[PDB]
């Protein structure tokens, strides 16, 4: 009744190592989930030993943004028509800025281009306590109880202690921490139509009892926005998979912060409209051939996702061209 798939596990570990070596990185992790039941199909770590997917806390960076955008849509604090001013700004001395100046974006653009500014403005429409409860409901700070030793709850600071700038940076993934397994888990709220899943190391005959975070319509709209990340104009085109539409988010978190020391993340699901698989890839401190999540973690995501769909017998939803 173990949920692991050895063929997916082998594929994930082989592609993970190829990427870690090619980019001359220190380490990497991969999680592959059943997008419908939360069954864990593969967990891969390199270099060997410690189960970093389970034990290692990371700041998720921009990989948290889909949930902030989803929450803002779900509560009616924005909609798919609003064009937000996304010029850089400061809260006191601390800047909030994107990799480019975008004068304005709608929420599709905020997702597609990965705007820290736009996401922080959406989050700022909620009180600190509301955002704190929301992050907790996503499971940040809540142990997975995977059964592995060395597992931590993650980090979610008490909202009463938050500075306004800290609520802002949390909304684009700094100042809170979770493991790649917890982050991959959060994505089941988007794939499983607004219902967060527990995840399991056992095969699930039916999707288990979960917990609603978003309306079903919100999740479906947000999955559609995330397809823009793998299409031209998005930050994650390296993750597009032949024959499928892929909903994804890229992340490029600085470590501590540092100039040129990063954690590159790529997380996505497919078929985007009716997801079957979530693949999450993190590459720790690439030093060659790029450092952003799309360029670094996209290519292994593409290979692991495409191979996982084929292994599982999922038919392409559009004609193959490659
Ligand atoms: Cl806990
Ligand atoms: Cl689809």
Author numbering: 236 to 282, 296 to 504, 509 to 574
Task: Pull verbatim passages from the article behind this deposition.
PBP2 is an essential peptidoglycan transpeptidase (TPase) that crosslinks the peptide chains from adjacent peptidoglycan strands during cell-wall synthesis. β-lactam antibiotics, including the extended-spectrum cephalosporin (ESC) ceftriaxone, are analogs of the d-Ala-d-Ala C terminus of the peptidoglycan substrate and as such target PBP2 by binding to and reacting with the active-site serine nucleophile (Ser310 in N. gonorrhoeae PBP2) to form a covalently acylated complex. PBP2 is comprised of an N-terminal membrane anchor, a putative pedestal domain, and a C-terminal catalytic TPase/β-lactam–binding domain. The serine nucleophile, Ser310, located at the N-terminal end of the α2 helix, is spatially adjacent to the β3 strand of the central β-sheet. β3 contains the conserved Lys497Thr498Gly499 (KTG) motif that twists during β-lactam antibiotic binding to form the oxyanion hole for acylation.
In order to provide a direct correlation of the dynamics observed by NMR with affinity for ceftriaxone separate from acylation, and elucidate whether pH changes and the H514A mutant have a consequence on the PBP2–ceftriaxone interaction, we introduced a catalytically inactive S310A mutant of tPBP2WT (tPBP2WT–S310A, hereafter referred to as tPBP2∗). To understand how pH affects the structure of tPBP2, we determined the crystal structures of tPBP2∗ at pH 7.5 and 9.5 and of tPBP2∗–H514A at pH 7.5. All structures were obtained in the same P21 crystal system, with two molecules present in each asymmetric unit, as previously reported for the WT enzyme. In the structure of tPBP2∗ determined at pH 7.5, the β3–β4 loop exhibits disorder in both molecules of the asymmetric unit but to different degrees. In molecule B, residues 501 to 514, a region spanning the β3–β4 loop, lack electron density, indicating disorder. Consistent with a conformational equilibrium of states, the loop in molecule B is disordered at pH 7.5, but upon binding ceftriaxone, it transitions to the inward and twisted conformation as observed previously in acylated crystal structures of PBP2 (17).
